[PDB]
Amino acid sequence: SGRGXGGXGL
Amino acid sequence: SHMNPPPPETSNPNKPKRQTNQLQYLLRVVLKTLWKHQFAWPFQQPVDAVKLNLPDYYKIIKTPMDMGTIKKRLENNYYWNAQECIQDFNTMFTNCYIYNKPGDDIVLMAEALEKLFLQKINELPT
């Protein structure tokens, strides 16, 4: 449901 | 403006305290194994919505939980029953699936950590 956090190095 | 909430409570000085084999396992094996995993770092402290610029995080997540909180709770003998601690791990994982879209990196990290968590709980001692 949220804006999200983008990439995390995967 | 928006602010972070205070972090979850980590001590309950009015609650009786005990150390059990299962609580020791949760701290020294379950939490320790997840803490050291390559995917653990986003889960080692409360979500910092201010520094991450997520003003919607605590609009969506009303029961935040993280492994730094769980570690402090175990160290403070906050949990009397192993199941209370297990519930906090479960809350941590479900929060991640509520806030983040399926297929996002953080969700795949949570799913990997959850799989390891369940593998560790499979061997919870007597």
XYZ file of C-alpha atoms in Angstrom:
136
model
C 0.000 0.000 0.000
C 2.923 2.426 0.463
C 5.340 4.562 -1.528
C 8.020 1.881 -1.177
C 11.782 2.134 -0.676
C 13.334 1.463 -4.097
C 16.346 -0.770 -4.613
C 18.180 -2.618 -1.820
C 21.080 -4.142 -3.763
C 19.356 -7.230 -5.163
C 6.161 18.117 8.780
C 6.023 14.495 9.922
C 7.884 12.761 12.716
C 8.908 9.285 13.717
C 6.850 7.715 16.496
C 8.754 6.713 19.610
C 10.265 3.244 19.184
C 8.438 0.275 20.701
C 8.724 -0.171 24.451
C 11.571 -2.522 25.378
C 11.214 -2.877 29.133
C 8.186 -3.542 31.332
C 9.511 -3.090 34.873
C 6.211 -4.229 36.377
C 6.132 -7.534 34.411
C 7.770 -10.587 36.058
C 10.993 -11.746 34.404
C 12.479 -15.150 33.691
C 15.118 -16.802 31.554
C 14.140 -20.039 29.828
C 15.913 -22.398 27.466
C 13.569 -21.320 24.668
C 14.063 -17.600 25.294
C 17.823 -18.157 25.347
C 17.546 -20.009 22.026
C 15.478 -17.182 20.552
C 18.146 -14.634 21.524
C 21.378 -16.575 20.961
C 20.322 -18.661 17.965
C 17.191 -17.357 16.240
C 17.776 -13.623 16.536
C 21.562 -14.034 16.203
C 21.292 -16.088 12.990
C 18.909 -13.584 11.384
C 20.899 -10.586 12.653
C 24.037 -11.805 10.879
C 22.297 -12.536 7.555
C 23.225 -10.414 4.553
C 19.615 -9.171 4.281
C 19.204 -8.152 7.943
C 20.332 -4.519 7.927
C 16.948 -2.867 7.050
C 15.334 -4.807 9.916
C 17.901 -4.093 12.660
C 16.230 -0.836 13.862
C 12.799 0.827 13.596
C 11.895 2.179 10.167
C 13.173 5.781 10.186
C 10.390 7.391 8.195
C 11.936 10.861 8.430
C 15.389 9.976 7.110
C 13.937 7.580 4.500
C 11.311 10.188 3.435
C 8.341 7.826 3.966
C 5.630 10.060 5.480
C 3.127 7.303 4.725
C 4.889 4.482 6.597
C 3.320 5.072 10.007
C 0.041 6.041 8.384
C -0.074 2.439 7.124
C 1.875 0.562 9.810
C 0.343 0.988 13.281
C 2.101 -1.987 14.912
C 5.765 -1.456 13.912
C 8.329 -4.039 14.936
C 11.973 -4.626 14.164
C 14.819 -6.923 15.139
C 16.605 -4.232 17.165
C 13.500 -3.956 19.335
C 13.224 -7.754 19.630
C 16.885 -7.974 20.679
C 16.402 -5.292 23.348
C 13.225 -6.996 24.560
C 15.022 -10.337 24.902
C 17.911 -8.631 26.720
C 15.453 -6.973 29.112
C 13.523 -10.226 29.729
C 10.505 -8.451 28.257
C 9.074 -11.771 27.068
C 7.826 -14.380 29.557
C 6.694 -16.818 26.841
C 8.569 -17.803 23.689
C 5.358 -17.243 21.705
C 5.359 -13.502 22.556
C 8.773 -13.190 20.908
C 7.754 -15.275 17.899
C 4.715 -13.008 17.492
C 6.989 -9.946 17.255
C 9.012 -11.572 14.453
C 5.773 -12.409 12.660
C 4.555 -8.806 13.027
C 7.842 -7.503 11.620
C 7.488 -9.673 8.515
C 3.800 -8.934 7.943
C 4.379 -5.173 8.250
C 6.872 -5.405 5.391
C 4.358 -7.215 3.174
C 1.651 -4.660 4.043
C 3.686 -1.568 3.190
C 5.776 -2.710 0.226
C 4.696 -3.823 -3.218
C 5.132 -7.492 -4.147
C 8.410 -8.002 -5.945
C 10.185 -5.080 -4.287
C 13.691 -5.811 -3.023
C 12.742 -5.344 0.630
C 9.952 -7.919 0.265
C 12.325 -10.522 -1.161
C 14.690 -9.802 1.731
C 11.870 -10.272 4.242
C 10.825 -13.540 2.573
C 14.378 -14.898 2.777
C 14.698 -13.867 6.429
C 11.311 -15.365 7.222
C 12.310 -18.680 5.620
C 15.431 -18.780 7.802
C 13.361 -17.795 10.858
C 11.028 -20.738 10.259
C 13.991 -23.080 9.763
C 15.366 -21.940 13.131
C 11.990 -22.260 14.878
C 11.710 -25.848 13.570
C 14.529 -26.680 16.028
C 13.264 -24.786 19.077
C 14.460 -26.846 22.076
C 12.199 -28.520 24.643
